[PDB]
Design a protein around this ligand. Structure first.
Ligand SMILES: CC[N+](CC)(CC)Cc1ccccc1
Ligand SMILES: [Mg+2]
Ligand SMILES: [Mg+2]
Ligand SMILES: [Mg+2]
Length: 340
């Protein structure tokens, strides 16, 4: 029973959910990892980890992934949720020095994860373990591209720190550009390739149909998170949300901003349906009779299928996850799963 303001009949009808067969083992292995890496207090892992649905999100997205690949992705994605919470708490508590240090340590650990596996900051050590694991699947050129993308993500989070401490709400286009980075669009897109077992050549992954399909998948997911997480974010003085930027800079009411964000999300869906046809036709064109053409064809088809799966996984995640259930909290500004 999705709230009417969030319900998207086209997702529910035309994007049937998928679940990776490794999901039951993934759930418990990631929860054990969060425990053993001390990424969340033991009592909060026990009360909340499963209800957060982080592994469910990844297992509905990277279909076809080798189990070991999906495990590293899920650990890394759970880490990224804990990092979002740490960033939030550093801003709320004014810990600009602790944030600047963490920011520098994540840049360094991203380039040399092996050196940071036992770092005193458990958030850095957990980061390093998952990244080292992700670096073991594909050639070093893929690792370099992952790192280049995530160094950009870290700096976008630094920009968020400064906006929120100065109480600056970005403008709408400013925000849309920043959101492609704080949502980690290009990391999810990069992770498609170890999930289908193939580093794609630049010529294939920069093909306009592949690029546009990948963009729209992520714009849908980021803006649907904005639509669904707007209440928790207003309650916690978050400023980064397309709806907040519309209410703040365009005098829209809550109702009007929500309607506009919905319309933008819906347009992502139908633009995706159009370019999906071209991206799958390109996957067909890559199968040229050769072994290599078959490899690339199958990899592009799997990645475009997972671009599609991201729509339904993100849609349902926001209605199942404890992360967004702000009406259940005694303190609406402090989620119970965050370390305060
Ligand atoms: C807070 C988690 N995340 C991961 C990119 C930022 C670290 C955004 C996100 C939210 C909801 C669904 C998917 C991703
Ligand atoms: Mg957040
Ligand atoms: Mg955030
Ligand atoms: Mg959000």
């Amino acid at each position: 029973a999705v709230p009417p303001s969030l319900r998207l009949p086209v997702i529910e009808a035309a994007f049937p959910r998928q679940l990776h067969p490794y999901w039951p083992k993934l759930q418990e292995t990631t929860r054990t990892w969060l425990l053993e890496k001390r990424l969340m207090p033991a009592d909060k892992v026990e009360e909340y980890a499963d209800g957060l649905c982080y592994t469910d999100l990844m297992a509905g997205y990277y279909l076809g992934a080798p189990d070991e690949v999906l495990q590293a992705i899920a650990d890394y994605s759970a880490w990224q949720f804990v990092w979002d919470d740490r960033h939030d708490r550093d801003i709320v508590h004014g810990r600009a020095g602790a944030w600047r240090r963490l920011r520098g340590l994540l840049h360094t650990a991203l380039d040399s994860p092996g050196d940071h596996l036992h770092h005193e900051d458990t958030l850095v050590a957990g980061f390093a373990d998952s990244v080292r694991r992700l670096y073991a699947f594909l050639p070093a050129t893929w690792n370099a591209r992952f790192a280049r993308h995530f160094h950009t993500v870290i700096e976008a989070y630094d920009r968020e720190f400064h906006n929120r401490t100065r109480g600056i709400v970005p403008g709408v286009e400013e925000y849309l550009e920043l959101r492609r980075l704080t949502f980690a669009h290009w990391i999810w897109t990069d992770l498609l390739e170890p999930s289908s077992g193939c580093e794609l050549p630049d010529a294939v992954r920069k093909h306009p149909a592949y690029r546009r399909a990948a963009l729209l998948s992520q714009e849908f997911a980021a803006w649907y998170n904005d639509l669904c997480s707007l209440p928790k974010e207003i309650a916690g003085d978050e400023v980064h949300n397309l709806g907040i930027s519309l209410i703040t800079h365009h005098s829209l009411t809550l109702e009007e901003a929500i309607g506009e964000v919905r319309r933008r999300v819906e347009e992502c869906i139908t633009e995706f349906l159009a370019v999906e046809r071209d991206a799958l036709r390109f996957a067909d064109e890559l199968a040229d009779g050769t072994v290599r053409g078959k490899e690339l064809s199958g990899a592009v088809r799997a990645n475009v299928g997972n671009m599609r799966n991201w729509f339904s996984s993100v849609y349902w995640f926001h209605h199942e996850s404890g992360r967004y259930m702000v009406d259940s909290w005694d303190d609406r500004s402090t989620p119970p799963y965050v370390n305060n």
